[PDB]
Amino acid sequence: SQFTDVKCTGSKQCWPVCKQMFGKPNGKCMNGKCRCY
């Protein structure tokens, strides 16, 4: 997992975040913050 500080309630929210931050959308909302894979 890659850490982010981006808050979230649902995993789909994390897809654009992870795409911007790490180059792929694969990501889940984990304990209220995005994690990217």
Swiss-Prot record:
Q: Which domain of life is it from?
A: Eukaryota
Name the site position(s) for Basic residue of the functional dyad: 28
Q: What is this protein called?
A: Potassium channel toxin alpha-KTx 1.5
Q: Iron as a keyword?
A: no
Q: List the disulfide bonds.
A: 8-29, 14-34, 18-36
Q: Where located? A: Secreted
The Gene Ontology CC terms held by the record are:
extracellular region
Molecular function GO terms recorded: ion channel inhibitor activity; potassium channel regulator activity; toxin activity
UniProt KW keywords: Calcium-activated potassium channel impairing toxin, Disulfide bond, Ion channel impairing toxin, Neurotoxin, Potassium channel impairing toxin, Pyrrolidone carboxylic acid, Secreted, Signal, Toxin, Voltage-gated potassium channel impairing toxin
Name the residues annotated as site: Aromatic residue of the functional dyad: 37
Q: Which residues carry this modification: Pyrrolidone carboxylic acid?
A: 2
Respond yes or no to whether keyword Transcription regulation is given for this record. no
Organism field? Olivierus martensii
Family that this chain belongs to: Belongs to the short scorpion toxin superfamily. Potassium channel inhibitor family. Alpha-KTx 01 subfamily.
Question: Know anything about its domains from the record?
Answer: Has the structural arrangement of an alpha-helix connected to a beta-sheet by disulfide bonds (CSalpha/beta).
Tissues and organs where the protein is expressed, per its UniProt entry: Expressed by the venom gland.
State which stretch of the full-length protein is shown: 21 to 56 of 57
Report the protein's function: Potent blocker of both large-conductance calcium-activated potassium channels (KCa1.1/KCNMA1) and voltage-gated potassium channels (Kv1.3/KCNA3). Has also been shown to moderately inhibit Kv1.2/KCNA2 and weakly inhibit Kv1.1/KCNA1 channels, as well as 5-hydroxytryptamine 3 receptors (HTR3A).
